[model samples]
Target: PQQQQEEVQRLLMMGEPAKGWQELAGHLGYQAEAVETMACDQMPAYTLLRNWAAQEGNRATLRVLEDALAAIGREDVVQVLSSPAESSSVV
Candidate 1:
């Protein structure tokens, strides 16, 4: 369906896939889908998270993106990617 595809694209655009699997590979001690997503379109909270995750500590950046997607009405992504997180910020 077109809707499903759009949602997938959005997920990729938000870095959900990579994030999901990264958790799995990194032994994040939780469940994750690693749906894959993009950079921009993320919220303020996500910006901090991304920067943190990419550098050191927690690496829960995707959580922020997932929250933003949900806030923007893309609960589908939030649901699959929004498993859980330790912290919501970096540094």
Candidate 2:
């Protein structure tokens, strides 16, 4: 479906994907204005963006682009790539 493909493109736009991920992280709702800077070349901003996105969206919400990044060796972010069933029911 259109949305399935939509999941993956959001982060890849950053030519520097980590940098780009942070840019998109700033795009969701209130996060648009603020997010602490961190080491992204060595890792992805999974927790920051996920926590922000999850602040409004439900458990089914996702950042499929993160999964794609993880596929390329960003294992640091694999911690956030939980499948629907694998994602925790609680915050």
Candidate 3:
């Protein structure tokens, strides 16, 4: 799971002048303004995921994350995270 987390951060953190993490956060229920605030910090993408997981607790499953990614039109990311070659069981 930790590897998956890193993979997600890496993908979201991609791009130069225009990153997708902010929009991803917004799709995950974070306010645009709040995500802007997070952008100022280092590793804001990871921070956003951490905070989201903390807030959602047991509800912060990969399915929820996948749905958020899908909402943000990041199905590429969803595919990577949901690769059948990786471990299948979530619980």
Clash count, one per candidate: 18, 0, 0
Worst window of 10 by summed lDDT in candidate 1: 30-39
lDDT of 2 by residue, 3-59 (tens): 432443333533544444455444433343343343332233444334444563333
lDDT of 1 by residue, 13-37 (tens): 4534444323322333322233122
Indicate which candidate wins on lDDT.
Answer: 3
Query: Clashes in candidate 1: how many?
Result: 18
User: Each candidate: what lDDT?
Assistant: 0.38, 0.40, 0.61
Judge candidate 1 against the unseen true structure and give its global Cα lDDT, from 0 to 1: 0.38
Better of 2 and 3 by TM-score: 3
> Order the candidates by lDDT, highest first — what do you get?
3, 2, 1
Identify the superior model by lDDT, candidate 1 or candidate 3.
3
Off by over 4 Å in 1: 1-52, 56-65, 80-91
Sort by TM-score, best first: what order?
3, 2, 1
Model 3 regions more than 4 Å off: 14-19, 80-91
lDDT of the structure predicted as candidate 3: 0.61
